[PDB]
């Protein structure tokens with residue numbers, strides 16, 4: 001297993017990265033320091049995660065310590081939904097750069113295809129609890145992302161939570177300047193994404209799997225919900241390899257030619273999650289894990305099911 005995958009800009013992206021959603025500001029600095037110590041070279045960030053300054057502190061410290069140089073790191077962030085207007089994109093990117101204390105990003109994603117009303121609130125609601133959309137569209141936001149590459153703020157651009165028709169919309173845009181390098185989507189044994197992965201890989205778009213452990217810490221989660229880490233069937237596959245369930249869940253997407261971004265703030269788990277280059281899941285293991293698919297999403301963006309650009313009505 002080579003540890004990096006080639007993108008359409010000639011850069012190589014580490015297949016294992018550290019996720020940072022729900023990593024509290026008061027713990028994520030240490031998590032990122034430990035991750036860098038440990039061997040992680042890819043960090044998945046976002047403005048909406050409300051912790052980019054603290055991620056940036058950690059990166060700065062490890063650069064100052066001479067542990068890594070900037071060129072060896074692969075830093076990803078994402079344009080939040082309240083900044084889809086073409087006139088807001090550059091400022092949103094530069095705010096992320098300032099918080100991260102960086103002068104470029106390796107990859108910048110449109111976080112979701114849905115634009116939300118601009119303003120201070122990340123999830124702006126009306127008096128009846130509906131997300132308030134903005135009058136923005138995918139193609140105009142993409143053109144504004146392209147400008148960030150031309151100006152040297154970001155090395156590559158991509159998308160996240162786009163269905164195949166929304167990807168197609170960008171690919172088919174007259175006067176396209178950059179193709180999306182990556183589509184970052186939820187993917188794990190309960191949502192295996194066979195059709196969208198086949199689509200993206202066939203189009204030369206690298207897929208990153210988010211919530212690979214099933215996001216047990218997500219804020220809506222209902223107790224009766226399926227639980228990957230607790231799945232006794234996956235526990236048995238792990239036991240046969242002398243690995244943990246989490247390690248099996250991380251290795252799984254790696255063997256599908258995906259990038260994967262497990263999140264932890266716990267030092268032992270950060271280290272555990274990186275120790276996935278010393279074993280292989282068998283053909284049968286892969287087939288068995290794939291067979292657990294239920295089309296079950298932990299990040300369904302239910303507040304936005306009426307949005308014109310809601311991505312999950314389509315089959316894929």
Ligand SMILES: NC(=O)c1ccc[n+]([C@@H]2O[C@H](COP(=O)([O-])OP(=O)(O)OC[C@H]3O[C@@H](n4cnc5c(N)ncnc54)[C@H](OP(=O)(O)O)[C@@H]3O)[C@@H](O)[C@H]2O)c1
Nearest residue numbers: 019020021210211212213214215217246262263264265266
């Ligand atoms: N583009 C998008 O829309 C989007 C959406 C969702 C996620 N993401 C990205 O993907 C990342 C990963 O997804 P996620 O945060 O939803 O969830 P996840 O990585 O599937 O699961 C994270 C949870 O698993 C725990 N954990 C981690 N390693 C473990 C291990 N070895 N053993 C047991 N428990 C373990 C963590 O606990 P502790 O942290 O307490 O150790 C945390 O509660 C995010 O952080 C974010 O960077 C992107």
Ligand SMILES: Cc1nc2c(-c3ccc(Cl)cc3)nc3ccccc3c2c(=O)n1CC(=O)O
Nearest residue numbers: 021046048049050111122123219220299302303
């Ligand atoms: C899927 C997702 N949901 C939320 C949610 C969220 C999740 C589930 C419900 Cl039902 C409503 C909102 N809230 C946040 C609050 C503050 C900071 C970040 C979030 C986020 C958030 O960052 N994500 C992750 C993402 O979009 O990457």
